[PDB]
Amino acid sequence: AVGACVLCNSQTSLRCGACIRRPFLCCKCCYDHVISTSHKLVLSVNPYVCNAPGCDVTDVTQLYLGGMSYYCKSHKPPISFPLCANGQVFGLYKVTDFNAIATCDWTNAGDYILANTCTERLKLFAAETLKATEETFKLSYGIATVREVLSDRELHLSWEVGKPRPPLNRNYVFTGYQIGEYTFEKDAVVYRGTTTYKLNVGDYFVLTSHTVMPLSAPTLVPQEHYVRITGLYPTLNISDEFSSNVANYQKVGMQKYSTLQGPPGTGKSHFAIGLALYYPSARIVYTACSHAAVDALCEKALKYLPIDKCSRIIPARARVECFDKFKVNSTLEQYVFCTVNALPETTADIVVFDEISMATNYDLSVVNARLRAKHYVYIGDPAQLPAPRTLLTKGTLEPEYFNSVCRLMKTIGPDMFLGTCRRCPAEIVDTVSALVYDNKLKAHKDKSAQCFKMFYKGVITHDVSSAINRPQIGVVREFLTRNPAWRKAVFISPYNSQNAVASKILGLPTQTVDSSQGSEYDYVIFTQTTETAHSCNVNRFNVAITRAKVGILCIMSDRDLYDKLQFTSLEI
Ligand SMILES: [Zn+2]
Ligand SMILES: [Zn+2]
Ligand SMILES: [Zn+2]
16 A cells, blocks of 8 residues: 555555545645545545544545544544645645546546546556446446347347446447357347357346556657667668658657558558568567457468468457467467457567557557567557547547547657558549548549439438438439449448448448448448438548448538538439
8 A cells, every 4th residue: 555646656655545546646646636626535554534433534634643543623632633734635755637537427528638638647547547437337237138039140138127228239249148248239139149159048148347457558658769770670672562661661760659640541551561571570569459450460461471470369258250370379479460458468679559540548558568669650540430438428539639649640740641542532532631631642543433422311210329311221222223333332321220221221231430440342332321420520431431442422411521522413
């Protein structure tokens, strides 16, 4: 019970017993906390409570040191010192932002803003507090017990009365009782077990609430600039394919950490793997939050790096099928491909952290904690989608508050920018260039003349809160009869329930914008479904239309985003 103060580091015996993370606070900082918030319980070796029998005064502002023990006003002896005096709380070795972080419920955008604009030690406190609150909220939702099993991909669920019903999408992963992790999709519900188990009638599902480990490492190690490439040895014989990136690879080697903003299809993955080929002896750990982002780096490595120096690290509690062509769990291979949550304790010459828009400060810290590296490279795009904030319901989280890397990218700018989109027809590139990239994204491809927009509000129905627009799906169905080439299109919409209906009426493969990110398709059909904040979010809209290599059809509800699309308008 003798640690360091989360605000000024000063050693102390005092934690805050009201904070859910119980942070060590120094005498000066502990006072400024307890006098300004509803937080009054101060723990030490013993708690700061009235030592008098039966007395229930725990508020430190109402307590005194009577010799060696603690008493309230009613029980203190004549010779006693008030625990709160001259801006201090009595303890051994004798904050506005900290107070907002410590007391907020994380339902408001301003909470996240302050967790990303505060000091570095307060970013870790914020990250721990948020994640603990997120997990304790999971305990609040109602248990689902199996009433009857229809098929191998359908059952009917009995929901706990009194406790709310969680959103039934891919985002909410349940644990069966352990018969493995299970997900659900909309009385018939589609059940997807990570284990093919005969789901017995009477078995129940709960959202797995995990213990939040404390953070120690910063989100971002302190920046060091070097005059020469440090601890890395470049090739001279370097493949013409990666000639464009060489000046940026020499920037990576001349700084402790670097930021790469790579808009869609600009060569992020190419940049990541080309770093290995430019420093052929350097040990590189490839990390991202999702298995899909780590698999994508694996696929690009399989093509350019020797397969006997690559390992795919898989946690023994396997959640979804991931990359199978590398040696599994060989922690010591020159090239290690691992999700942030599964990272081992190791060192590296270079750490490459991919899809940085999806990373939380919690993740940024866990990386700096498990990996000690000569160089850290952060790759992604603050104009693409952040991790879902399940507690955030009031206000939108702007890109500059996604995490510490995105904040640097949006304030001082990224160290390196991939400026040329090679995936998308120019109609899409020009639209997103103006929308989110300040006219700095350039199109390699010509206009395809296969990018179309239709303004059609249709009719919005709701599967609980998830939205459906049957007319917008109807307009698409009529388009498909006249446009046979599009028969191979991926259907994209901001809503699972819109996609479930699109799948039955159209038979097209189906993707939410969020699940589409990092993917590409020749033809995309996008139905905006609604004019909500969710469906009008410029990041989500940017990701939606930059999935397409050849054609896109956008059935829009929002006049603003419709008018911004530099697409051929359709009638009907
Ligand atoms: Zn302090
Ligand atoms: Zn507190
Ligand atoms: Zn008392």
